[PDB]
Design a protein around this ligand. Sequence first.
Ligand SMILES: N=C(N)c1ccc(C[C@@H]2CCCC[C@@H](Cc3ccc(C(=N)N)cc3)C2=O)cc1
Ligand SMILES: [Ca+2]
Length: 223
Amino acid sequence: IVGGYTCGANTVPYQVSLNSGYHFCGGSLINSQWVVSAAHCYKSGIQVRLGEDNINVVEGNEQFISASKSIVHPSYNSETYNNDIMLIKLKSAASLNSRVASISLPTSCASAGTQCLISGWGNTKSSGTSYPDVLKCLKAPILSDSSCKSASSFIITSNMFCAGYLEGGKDACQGDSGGPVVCSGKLQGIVSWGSGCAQKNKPGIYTKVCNYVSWIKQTIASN
Ligand SMILES: N=C(N)c1ccc(C[C@@H]2CCCC[C@@H](Cc3ccc(C(=N)N)cc3)C2=O)cc1
Ligand SMILES: [Ca+2]
């Protein structure tokens, strides 16, 4: 997260860190047994880390639980990032508490201008590299598709939205991948892609979760 702020320990209790010996992606807890992340975060050997703030220090509220199954969206395309979404089932149910909590799925989509909270342990620099150890947060509005497309020349689909600031300085970044965009209490986005971070006319691109709620619900019910 570039140009954000330190969230405060466990103030985003649905945020998880996916760990394969090191943090490599974010994710969102959606019930005690399931996490939602980006399909581009797919790999084997995922341990889900819940209740984290400092990912390098055991602070006392963590739960580490291995993934039993990962399900990449049936139509994920790794070239275009269309349908950039994946479910991860936990080997054992998380113990839900004030620091480990699920986030509600949308009942409808969010509209341009709605403010959202984006969070993660990704790079905090627009130039070069610095990785934080504590969770970072950013408030950012959804942008209209038309303004996003004209400003950036990005090719996006109806399954993506843009959020952030066209002037630059505030954005998600590498390492935030797979993490939450929460708007008005609902998980509307997943950190998906972009160009650089916090660059002018290059806003963040997010998977449009409202389009996938039916798939999420049916997949969880059947697995
Ligand atoms: N055409 C595409 N769909 C496309 C373009 C570039 C990339 C690679 C890169 C690098 C590889 C890791 C995935 C992803 C990480 C990322 C996340 C957020 C932001 C941001 N909000 N500024 C930037 C980058 C990315 O966009 C992937 C997909
Ligand atoms: Ca920790």
